[PDB]
Antibody, heavy 231, light 208 residues
């Protein structure tokens, strides 16, 4: 089957330019059958249309370009049909433009239409490429305690870059009841995550609980003792 | 805009239908997506199936509602389904997605623990309320935050549910505040909706 392959930088600094190329194989972008364009998906969120365009060989005019209105002012999409490539350029980016970007082939009322073509559905998707937007340099985490039948306690692991961090408890001696969550990318362009463990309430006065945070990209390890609150 | 329910579920072999409201024309489509993978078109033009898509998937629509039916649910039908339509002259929009769970274990309501900002974070001039949501199934929730009795939208980040070691699901949600915001309100709440229940936990700056 045909393939759409995205290429381009996976990390772009804030207010700078996000550029991607899509290389089409096994089909020709110079057909009047389809539009070519882009869709993105922020981590943990839904799909968002970016836009699509057409430029086919014909005896009439076939140049059409449609953009998502909320992106248009900083959006350029283009086709180089001889190279069988589609291009995306998004300027003035912020962390909020962090997303998996998908090359997309759109069908609909395209070849035969009334008034204007109406590409409506994507029948071929690229694998997708994750582009993270942050101006951060490598930075180790700050670690704060989430202080506590059973009780939950944890560590809030803040403001690090890039991914990933890993977390253990009591140098690995505490594994039962542990859950470490996925990170969130914050508007600062830094990540945070939490790690939690559920333990017996009766152990809080007498058992020591330390989270061990490893951030290999910054060669940082942080150990944080989590104590019961004074109230 | 297109609106979909957050979650749908059924047992293997059963039929399920998920709705998408806000549609109009016949340029309705449906996509299936697995974690960490690209969506796949399963229905286009209301009821047409691409080659290779099982006849177990069908589409219908009435007026301002479109529906995807999956008959004979199979485990690997589990995933997130997006509806989509052409709107205006030539725009494409998407629904927010429905997580379709193919039931493989008992339903379980979430346990919710809400941590106030730590003294140490407040001393660092930041404040994060941490709402930790655990031991639930199906793995889909919606999280809302309140300041006193008022909805709060800004400063909220929520992770996608993922499996715990015991194979139930957990999720996390964060409300970022300034220390002044935290101290100036009577309380803050994390409200977690799961299937037909809501569980709300509340914390206060004046209480421990």
């Amino acid at each position: 089957q045909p393939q759409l392959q995205e290429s381009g930088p996976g990390l772009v600094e804030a207010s700078e330019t996000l550029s991607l190329t899509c290389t089409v194989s096994g089909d020709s972008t110079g057909r009047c059958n389809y539009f070519w364009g882009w869709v993105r998906q922020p981590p943990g969120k839904g799909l968002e249309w970016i836009g699509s365009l057409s430029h086919c060989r014909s005896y009439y005019n076939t140049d059409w370009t449609y953009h998502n209105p909320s992106l248009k002012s900083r959006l350029t999409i283009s086709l180089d049909t001889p190279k069988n490539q589609v291009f995306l350029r998004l300027t003035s980016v912020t962390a909020a433009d962090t997303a998996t970007y998908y090359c997309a082939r759109f069908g609909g009322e395209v070849l035969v239409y009334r008034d204007w073509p109406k590409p409506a559905w994507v029948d071929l998707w690229g694998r997708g490429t994750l582009v993270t937007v942050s101006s951060a340099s490598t930075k180790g985490p700050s670690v704060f305690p989430l202080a506590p039948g059973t009780a939950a306690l944890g560590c809030l692991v803040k403001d690090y870059f890039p991914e990933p961090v890993t977390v253990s408890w009591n140098s690995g001696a505490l594994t039962s009841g542990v859950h470490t969550f996925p990170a969130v990318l914050q508007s600062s362009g830094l990540y945070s995550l939490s790690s939690v463990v559920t333990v017996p309430s009766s152990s809080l006065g007498t058992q020591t609980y330390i989270c061990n945070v490893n951030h290999k990209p910054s060669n940082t390890k942080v150990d944080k003792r989590v104590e019961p609150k004074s109230c | 805009a297109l609106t979909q329910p957050p979650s749908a579920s059924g047992s293997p072999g059963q039929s399920i239908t998920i709705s998408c409201t806000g549609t109009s024309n016949n340029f309705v489509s449906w996509y299936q997506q697995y974690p960490g993978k690209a969506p796949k078109l399963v229905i286009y033009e209301v009821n047409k199936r691409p080659s290779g898509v099982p006849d177990r998937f069908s589409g219908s629509k009435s007026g301002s509602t479109a529906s995807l039916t999956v008959s004979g649910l199979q485990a690997d039908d589990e995933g997130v389904y997006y509806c989509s339509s052409l709107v205006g002259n030539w725009d494409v929009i998407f629904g927010g997605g429905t997580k379709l769970t193919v039931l493989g274990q008992p339903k379980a309501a979430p346990s919710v623990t809400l941590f106030p900002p730590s003294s140490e974070e407040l001393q660092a001039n930041k404040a994060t309320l941490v709402c930790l949501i655990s031991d639930f199934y199906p793995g889909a929730v919606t999280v809302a935050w309140k300041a006193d009795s008022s909805p709060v939208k800004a400063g909220v980040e929520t992770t996608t549910p993922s499996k715990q070691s015991n194979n139930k699901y957990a999720a996390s949600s964060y409300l970022s505040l300034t220390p002044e915001q935290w101290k100036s309100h009577r309380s803050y709440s994390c409200q977690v909706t799961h299937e037909g229940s809501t569980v709300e936990k509340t914390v206060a700056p004046t209480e421990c």
